[PDB]
């Protein structure tokens, strides 16, 4: 075998402790670059003029932040969607002032994570598995793309992408609510049903299986020793779990088929999160949450407030305060 | 019109209130719209010179039709609610408007995304079926069982 | 793929109970503190620095300005029994908006 | 920055005390007769 064949065999080998593969060939360097840049920046990067108004925001630990307040800060509004690699800057000091690290990190990360998805497909193929775990991973991946790439594209600037930090994430959410009324958007609502529902069904399934574990141990040992890795028989009694849950609600509201049950466990959070992502991705082009401001009016024409109008007052507070030095004209149009 | 010198008017941040430079020096509009300096449109280009927006043309050559068009476009920005209330999220009901650019963009992002999902679904499945394990693992021939342990 | 994996099915399903159940319990504890206004509202070190240094800015201080907007703009209608009358000149607002 | 002066030892003992508890239990399990 020639060197190229040998190389291919190693790359695609099923015997490596961590699978490499062709997607991995792109994934490994890209993720390494984003990770190393992120760590260095989070610790040591100087303040970044996020909104392009010569008002630098400090994100790093050494420059006055803790874990909660710290972030890698989005690139400058003056840059917009322009590509800003290191080599476009006159110097590293310039690169840092303008938020170059943010772009390096999000681009390497989105590429690497896309490749992580591909790699899940690939290993599934090498092992003779069915292929759709990667489809499940498309839901969180799409969500990352929405907040790091699609929202910036729609708004015209990477300065409006989600910051790489805890408090910065909260900032992104609050401004998003001011600008799009996301809580009143049905795709975010489906998202919430997706994650609340996912947590519910996680707990529910965990609890039902745990409840029907077949006795294999004594009281003085963990019941977990009753399962042995790779044993052929199922470790809990699905018939009993179904008898239970079926009587909790009614018979036909409970799954008796383990396959349908597990498909449901996959599909409910995945679909809901797909809609969460599509929410952000469509509010990116300013198709916003439902607007019922002054929808209810009395016989004379007096406005009768509903809870929607209280939401509106909250959103106004957010709107009038955000980026307090960046607007010169009355309408915030992106 | 009120008498401001728009070239020399310094905004609260130190950047020009109306006019500033792009990162490569071109004269562009200020405020948040600094992000949109790549914009080009027939109502704006006549005020454009070699170095970007031209202060002399701005002072002397702006026509009523340009004022009209800029007013029209400013008040038909592609922002609006799902129930077609025009304007920012905090705007009151009155104007029935969501830009066709928004309808078209949003619909086609949704469709393109689900079509990528469909590509993954059918590509993975086609691979599995061509290889012969799309229905599951052969219990008597489970490939992982013939592989050396990872550790 | 990920470096680690479940090998015990019983532990796997127990963990599925543990994670969301414990999360919800933790949120409940925080809300009990909020019943008393015992908030995690501030970082004191942040506030001392920002008070002294008008060039010091983080996402933390940026979010507090948003909170202040919410309070002033929502309170009069959300808390009608207080009979708040906040004249226009006292409302917190950035430039133009 | 004017941090709380007890924060350092609070964090240190928060990490050390339960970590050590776990290490003790693990090592004495390993040394039990196979």
């Amino acid at each position: 075998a020639n060197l190229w064949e040998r190389f291919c065999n190693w790359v695609t080998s099923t015997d490596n402790r961590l699978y490499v593969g062709w997607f991995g060939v792109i994934m490994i360097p890209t993720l390494l670059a984003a990770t190393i840049c992120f760590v260095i920046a989070f610790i040591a990067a100087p303040p970044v003029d996020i909104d392009g108004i010569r008002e630098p925001v400090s994100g790093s630990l050494l420059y006055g932040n803790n874990i909660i307040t710290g972030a890698v800060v989005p690139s400058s509004n003056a840059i917009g969607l322009h590509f800003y690699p290191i080599w476009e800057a006159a110097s590293l000091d310039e690169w840092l002032y303008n938020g170059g690290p943010y772009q390096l990190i999000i681009f390497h990360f989105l590429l690497g994570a896309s490749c992580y998805m591909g790699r899940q497909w690939e290993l599934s193929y090498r092992l003779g598995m069915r292929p759709w775990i990667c489809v499940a991973y498309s839901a969180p991946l799409a969500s990352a793309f929405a907040v790091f790439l699609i929202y910036p594209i729609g708004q015209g600037s990477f300065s409006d992408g989600m910051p790489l930090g805890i408090s910065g994430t909260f900032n992104f959410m609050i401004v998003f609510q001011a600008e799009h009324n996301i809580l009143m958007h049905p795709f975010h609502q489906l998202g919430v049903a997706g994650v609340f529902g996912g947590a519910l069904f996680c707990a529910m399934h965990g609890s039902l299986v745990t409840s029907s574990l077949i006795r294999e141990t004594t009281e003085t040992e963990s019941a977990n020793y009753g399962y042995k890795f790779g044993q052929e028989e199922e470790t809990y009694n699905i018939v009993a779990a179904h008898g239970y849950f079926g009587r909790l609600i009614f018979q036909y509201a409970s799954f008796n088929n383990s396959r349908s049950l597990h498909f449901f466990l996959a599909a409910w959070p995945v679909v809901g999160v797909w809609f969460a992502a599509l929410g952000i991705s469509t509010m990116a082009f300013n198709l916003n949450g439902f607007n019922f401001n002054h929808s209810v009016i009395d016989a004379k024409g007096n406005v009768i407030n509903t809870w929607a109008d209280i939401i509106n007052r909250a959103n106004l507070g957010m709107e009038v305060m955000h980026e307090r030095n960046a607007h010169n004209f009355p309408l915030d149009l992106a | 019109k009120l008498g401001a010198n728009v070239g020399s008017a310094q905004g609260p941040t130190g950047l020009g209130k109306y006019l500033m430079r792009s990162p490569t020096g071109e004269i562009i509009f200020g405020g948040e719209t600094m992000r949109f300096w790549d914009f080009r449109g027939p109502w704006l280009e006549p005020l454009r010179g070699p170095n970007g927006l031209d202060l002399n043309k701005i002072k002397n050559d702006i026509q009523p039709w340009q004022e009209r068009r800029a007013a029209e476009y400013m008040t038909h920005a592609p922002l609006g609610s799902l129930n077609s209330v025009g304007g920012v999220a905090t705007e009151i009901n009155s104007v029935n408007f969501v830009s066709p650019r928004s309808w078209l963009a949003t619909s086609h992002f949704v469709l393109a995304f689900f079509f990528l999902v469909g590509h993954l679904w059918h590509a993975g499945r086609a691979r599995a079926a061509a290889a012969g394990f799309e229905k599951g693992i052969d219990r008597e021939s489970e490939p992982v069982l013939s592989m050396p342990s990872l550790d | 793929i990920f470096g680690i994996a479940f090998s015990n099915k019983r532990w796997l399903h127990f963990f599925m109970l543990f994670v969301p159940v414990t999360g919800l319990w933790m949120s409940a504890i925080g809300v009990v503190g909020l019943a008393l206004n015992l908030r995690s509202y501030d970082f004191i070190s942040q506030e001392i620095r920002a008070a002294e240094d008008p060039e010091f800015e983080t996402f933390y201080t940026k979010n507090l300005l948003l909170n202040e907007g919410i309070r002033a703009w929502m309170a009069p209608q959300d808390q009608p029994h207080e009979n708040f009358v906040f004249p226009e000149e006292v409302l917190p607002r950035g430039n133009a908006l | 920055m004017e941090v709380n002066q007890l924060g350092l030892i609070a964090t240190a003992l928060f990490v050390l005390v339960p970590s050590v508890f776990l290490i003790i239990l693990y090592v004495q399990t390993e040394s039990q007769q196979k």
């Binding site: 630990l61 890795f229 | - | - | 350092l8």
Partner: peptide, 30 residues
């Protein structure tokens, strides 16, 4: 000292990842 503490905890976490992956108790089919 705060920065040192944060970065130390993070570093310990990364080390833990390393041991958890490469020095795990190997899964064994009985």
């Amino acid at each position: 000292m705060e920065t040192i503490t944060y970065v130390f905890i993070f570093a310990c976490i990364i080390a833990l990842f390393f041991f958890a992956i490469f020095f795990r108790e190997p899964p064994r089919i009985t």
